[PDB]
Amino acid sequence: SAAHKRYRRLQNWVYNVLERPRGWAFVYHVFIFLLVFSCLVLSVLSTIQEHQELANECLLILEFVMIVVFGLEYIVRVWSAGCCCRYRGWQGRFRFARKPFCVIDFIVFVASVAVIAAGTATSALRSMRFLQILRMVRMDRRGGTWKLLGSVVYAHSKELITAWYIGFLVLIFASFLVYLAEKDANSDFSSYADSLWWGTITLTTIGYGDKTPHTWLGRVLAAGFALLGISFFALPAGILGSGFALKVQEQHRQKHFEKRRMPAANLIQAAWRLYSTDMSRAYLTATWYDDIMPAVKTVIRSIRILKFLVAKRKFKETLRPYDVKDVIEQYSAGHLDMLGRIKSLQTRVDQIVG
Amino acid sequence: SAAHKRYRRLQNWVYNVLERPRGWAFVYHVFIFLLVFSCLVLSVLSTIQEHQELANECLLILEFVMIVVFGLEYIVRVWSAGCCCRYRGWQGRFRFARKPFCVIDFIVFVASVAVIAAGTATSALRSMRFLQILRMVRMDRRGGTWKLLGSVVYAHSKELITAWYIGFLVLIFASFLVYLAEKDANSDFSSYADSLWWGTITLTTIGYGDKTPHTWLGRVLAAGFALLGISFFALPAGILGSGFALKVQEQHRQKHFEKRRMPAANLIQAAWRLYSTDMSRAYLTATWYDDIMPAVKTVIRSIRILKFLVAKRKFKETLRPYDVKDVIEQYSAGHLDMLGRIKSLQTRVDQIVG
Amino acid sequence: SAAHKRYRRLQNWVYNVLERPRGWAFVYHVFIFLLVFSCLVLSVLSTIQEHQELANECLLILEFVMIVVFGLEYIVRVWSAGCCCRYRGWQGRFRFARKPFCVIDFIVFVASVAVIAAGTATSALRSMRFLQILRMVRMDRRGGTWKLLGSVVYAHSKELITAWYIGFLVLIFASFLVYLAEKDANSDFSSYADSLWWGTITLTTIGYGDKTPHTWLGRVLAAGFALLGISFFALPAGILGSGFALKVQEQHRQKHFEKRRMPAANLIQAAWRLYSTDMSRAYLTATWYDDIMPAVKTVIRSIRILKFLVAKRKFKETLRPYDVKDVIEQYSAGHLDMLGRIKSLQTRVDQIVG
Amino acid sequence: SAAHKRYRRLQNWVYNVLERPRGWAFVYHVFIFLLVFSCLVLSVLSTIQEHQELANECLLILEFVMIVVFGLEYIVRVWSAGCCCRYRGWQGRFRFARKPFCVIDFIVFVASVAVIAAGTATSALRSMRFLQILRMVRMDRRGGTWKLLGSVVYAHSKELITAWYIGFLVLIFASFLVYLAEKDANSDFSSYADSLWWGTITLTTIGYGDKTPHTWLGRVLAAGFALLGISFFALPAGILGSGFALKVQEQHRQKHFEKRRMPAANLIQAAWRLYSTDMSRAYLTATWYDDIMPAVKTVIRSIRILKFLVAKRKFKETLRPYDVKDVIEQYSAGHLDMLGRIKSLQTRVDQIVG
Amino acid sequence: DQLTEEQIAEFKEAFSLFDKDGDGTITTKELGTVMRSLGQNPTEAELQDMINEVDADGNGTIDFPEFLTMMARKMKDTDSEEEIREAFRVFDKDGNGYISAAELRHVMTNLGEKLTDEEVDEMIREADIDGDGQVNYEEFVQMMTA
Amino acid sequence: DQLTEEQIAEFKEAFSLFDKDGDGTITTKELGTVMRSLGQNPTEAELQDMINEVDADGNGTIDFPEFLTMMARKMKDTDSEEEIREAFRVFDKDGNGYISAAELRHVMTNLGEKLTDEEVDEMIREADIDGDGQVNYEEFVQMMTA
Amino acid sequence: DQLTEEQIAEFKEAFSLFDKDGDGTITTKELGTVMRSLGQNPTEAELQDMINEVDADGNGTIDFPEFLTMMARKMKDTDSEEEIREAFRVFDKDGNGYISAAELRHVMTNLGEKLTDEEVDEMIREADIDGDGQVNYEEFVQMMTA
Amino acid sequence: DQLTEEQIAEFKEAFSLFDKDGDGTITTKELGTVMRSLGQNPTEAELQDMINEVDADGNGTIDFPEFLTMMARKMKDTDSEEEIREAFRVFDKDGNGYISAAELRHVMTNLGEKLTDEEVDEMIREADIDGDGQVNYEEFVQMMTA
Ligand SMILES: O=C1N(c2ccccc2)c2ccccc2C1(Cc1ccncc1)Cc1ccncc1
Ligand SMILES: [K+]
Ligand SMILES: [K+]
């Protein structure tokens, strides 16, 4: 089946460049991202009035190329799925298409083609261009980004809440005080809501210039409350940044340990030894040919199953992290073993000589 | 008292969801915050002139619903307090209402109802709406946020002061220099105070656009001093952010150790053993029936009191953190014990054989 | 000299509150800062034209109070210096005034009084008000702030330089590209220097609004280069912030160790033992009354001097930090001592029994 | 060759100040950078129209001085290269000029001189002034800055991508929502592209003031989405800052260990011992005078080559970092050696007495 | 519960069993001797810790005023009630002031100076256990502090 | 593969070799005794780990329902297929689901409870090795989980 | 306090008790021999540390110029005054230049090479103790550096 | 310096002193036996390290092609020149390519497999020392790599 070898190898290669790429494989993914983003920008610029014509000109060609490329890639991937054994035969292929994101892609492609066909409610067919962004959201395998952000936010919830709370209080207070001062001279601060708009647009450091204090009392108050609260409104970024950096460093610290090792290697061995109980040449002898005392081989198999289950557990446990108190534990084990050794010397000296 | 069982269990459940709720219980707390925040925003928008009518329209209904819900919750909580034994009978209930925040809530509720009743100095009755924000400040149990912020600020005081000091100096200097350059050409920089206003609004990165340099000398000076001092005016946020992140990580480090353990478990045991001295079946025998030599049992009790006091101390101590020099201490203990063991061998060999 | 006791105790107390304030002593220092700062703000506001009158009104009174208070404090401090033995008698007092900052203060005070007296070149007498800021710079004992900032900047020099370099390059490039696009349509971008001004005022996130791109090509280019380079222009703050936080934490880590201890205590003992060689009752006996063999006592003193010098060195060294490799060193010492102990057993067994 | 000594020493000194400056050597380097910067700024200001004359006035003199100084320095450096043995004689000199940056400098200098000569397409001769910036880019020996930035960016790629992704999503959404609200009342938000421009210029915190929301619904939406997304658009700076700081600290941690040591010292010794096999007085004896049994000395040399190769490897390995698990490894070695020692005692006691 | 004079005399008679010499003090010798006569075996470091809990003079002794204070107080003080309640809360993850009968049994017989089965049986009998099997330990703490 | 009644009786006969007394349980004594009779030498801690993998009652025994469940299941469960596949993936750096025959041989004979040469020879013979010398281990995992 | 020639001769006579052979040097042998004759028992490492404090040549000896310098200087140098004052400041938390008589007594008799009761009694007698019981240690340092 | 055939034959004759049996290989036995005959005392781990530096087959032997390569190359390769120069640079803090004669002497006789005085005397004689006493070690490295 040599040619079958080459077929399967190629299949696996393409499936790898699609499902999970490394090195040069990521180059194809970058090209796909550039295509979607260019389509998006062209659509946005099409929204303008002065540039509608050239925008639609370029958009027609780009959208056609996009539809063709993505249809082709969908077909090629659903085929390449053949490598893994799970999805073999049309049975397995259909099982594959049951995936959520695969059906999402097929829907998006069919919809794009239907739009272009209807091209020959035009405004709705336009608005439906925003769907492309799904081809970007899909790159996030299992919402990894959302999960990471959520974890890091939850871990620091206390500090974030403190920052937001104190900042909100300072904002209320400073807005009120400045409003009191500029109420009459300046027309911007007509009402309290205006003062609040000013306070937000200042403390955040956006600073439109819409409203600014005109009277010197207002200016001194604003300078003070700014140099006091601007730091509060900028904490969340700093807190989350340090959180992310520390998490990355600490993780990269766990990888250096390489603690899991030995358990994965032993599991394959216990599984092979159990499996080979029922097919090894070691059991194809006149001695083992089962007729007089079947239980002996069954008992031997039962022992290998128990050892397999011990190895599977030890293997799953390796994933869990380990503390730095192991050194104390090895000293405890080492001291105890040695103290017991001196006792065994002492008892033998006391036995012979007394 | 089975029904009494169910009563007490329900009471404890509600008191838990109100007093110190966790997990899914927080859903009720989030709903109360949304109701208060909506009331606040409606009031603010009522301040505007063009929207006064619809604002008051919605505010009437919202304020009524708010008064009813908060009165009901107050009554339900002051009842639910019954679970804990401290506040039993009207005696204990009143003892409960003595709390500061409970009386604060009762005052706020009575005041809101009085305002609505007077609805049928209208401007003062309006202004008194800001009181609602107390229902938000109360969520902070024992000013936790303020205390956390204060601790972290105090720990870093030196760096914060350095940043503010150097930044203030750079501001003074750059303002003076730019004023010197734009004094005549540009009308904005009429006086030194104007140049200072510009300098603050510039270095903080707010940038209203009120005043900007017009002459190229001023523009070069501003570019230089900006790309020099903008970093100074943004340090406090970075310093405090890293401080918070490091503190959180280091704390989360202590939890993994789980050092306190054993002391809490032993304290309950020493307390039970002391208590049972005066009621255990172990002392209800003819032997213990006290008439001839009362002191024997008293001496036994005195020993259990001393052990209880040792266990209470060891329990309180566990809360205190421990250093990483324990490994050196265990080696010192282990080496000393082993070196003493070889001496005891040496002395016995020298005793028998000599 | 009981009254002399009370005199000296009071003297030391005031000298402590002035030279080394701690706890409640800092309250007096905060009040002085409030006075100097109020004088400064009043002067600045005096610079304005519309407020000159009231400004000078308040400034007269404030400046008079300032001169009186600071003269009084100077006299009181130069007196209180009497506590320490270094500055006793007018000899020591003058030695005290030789300090740099003390002479600086005396100069500032004499100058302020001369200005007020001349009040009865008025513009120069005005301008000389800025001298007050020296009373703020003096609070920094030995330029601690500058030294801290310099240390932390030097330690990270590489990253800071990288950030500034890459940011400058991105600025040059983006300015050029946007200028190319807006050259004709928009009048702001008349020349390259204008485009550079825009680029700085944008990438720094100041954003005056002076010049903004008008043509859509310019707007897309600006959006891209902003969302690319704004992070570069904001790194220094983040880098320095994390540096300060980490340094503080690590220092606070050294304090827990308390390693120096024992050396300081032993130094005082070796010094007392050496000193007492020449005055102790232990040497005032017929035996020691020196006439026949003077060298014996001299030799005993020479030994105490050598031990004093060993203790002074061990004491000075304690200040130096120690590595975490000490545990390996104690194991090396412990193992070697134990391995030598088993050898001494082995040799004795081989000696007696052979 | 004493004078030759002085010649070579001077040569090495200048080559060190130019090629590898350290300490006070950097003073010359700062002057060269300051002169290059002065030329750039003058050119830029020459771009303006109102200042063209004085700009060219100063530029002529500065450019002439620049050409002379850089030509002189080039000649002096290409000469000073003589110190190192690699480039001796004109052969070695030319080998030196083969370097990339050296030829780059020579090209820039020849081009500058050709421009000034043509001074006596003037616009192209102008535009060619930007070449000077190469004299700044050259200071980066082997693109150290780019490599550092790339390493730190790659290590954190996941967090950066998460921040950019979530920020982009929030931007799209908030822009759409605000556009919906201001579509009619305000003229700025004419089309969707305008709303996107506003969204970027706000969330980045630039805040030109070009377009701002006018209707209160738009203002509330903008306040919310700002206080939500401004932190997202500011993460990259915080993440990269903490990354740089942590990397610097951890590196500075490796230097304290000083682990490499001993290997470099032993390598020189094994190399000297191998080299001296063929020239030492130890082999210039009648015994070694090779004629009868040449292989004996060859075998001795072969052993020294093998030891040299072991020492070279151990030396190269020292550069690699080492883990903190060495303490466990020394305990394992120490325990095993001691446990084997007690066994050797036990066997001898059992041998003699039995 | 004012301390009466007859109660003081009964404490004095117990104190005199330790201080048989009439010296007015209890050292580790007197304390440990009475304890071992009853079949207890404290270590020297345990006898020092016990005396140190009530020795204000810091000279390694217990005098009668210190003995009387300890005996009059037992566990009735507020510090004892709070710390015992804090110890239960270590094992109350819900934070509702409850602990399971089976969880109390595990902690009492498996951690620390483990209770025997009969000791822990008496302890669970004495707590008014609910029908579910959950123990309200804060009312258990008040019964030991009453 | 419905478990039949004759299959249950054959498991019962094996179970009775361990539990020769008819007590309905297998302890470390019964398990370790049968194992050492075959020339195996488990430690006590290894016998406890083995029993603990199937002892739901936590009393240190295996009863027949637990024995039958283990024997009926072998490695056919989805947890076994996933964990075995995760173990191979430790040694698949490419992430393509392949491992070299020579790399499999190194890991099997040099790590853990090393396979003998003959064991590992049979293992590489049983995997349908490609002509390059690369093994698709996920189909190797399904053959052991079938 | 110019060093006089008779003072130099008295130092020379002490130096010659160590260097009895007239070799012009003091090694650990000569130093330690004189010390043990007086009933002291330094270790070898303590004798090396002592010689190393004044051995500029680094060859493990003290010569007469080094001996004379040490004897002429005693503790009068500014380095000694500063370091001794820094040692007291370790135990001055207030920062006011004071230390309690009772705190000085605790540190002198409980840390380091503890002073005997009689030694520490003479030390507290020699400091002009204030009526409160507080010692100004900086004037105590000048009396030892005079 | 093309390797000639007579040079190859002289290497072969040295190789045959190790491999006296004519098996074409040098193991730790053959290498260590010749070394100890000359009075050297390598350890087993040192003999394994030496063979491993040139054993490409990884079977613990040196064959003649590997032996010839090592002998023809000595230290002339560019890797040797660079690493030796990097070792000197460890002790050149100035970065100027110089090291003091006295500093070279300290490192050679006090670190590592210390040179004897006579060895280090020959080494400093062979470097063309400057009149100051500073050694240009990069030309010292080229003399050992020539
Ligand atoms: O050094 C450390 N240890 C540690 C050292 C010796 C013995 C025991 C423990 C430790 C333990 C838990 C978290 C962090 C640490 C650090 C750093 C580290 C370095 C490499 N890999 C993991 C971590 C930092 C640290 C330093 C000083 N004080 C406290 C913490
Ligand atoms: K900004
Ligand atoms: K801004």
Ligand SMILES: [K+]
């Ligand atoms: K603006």
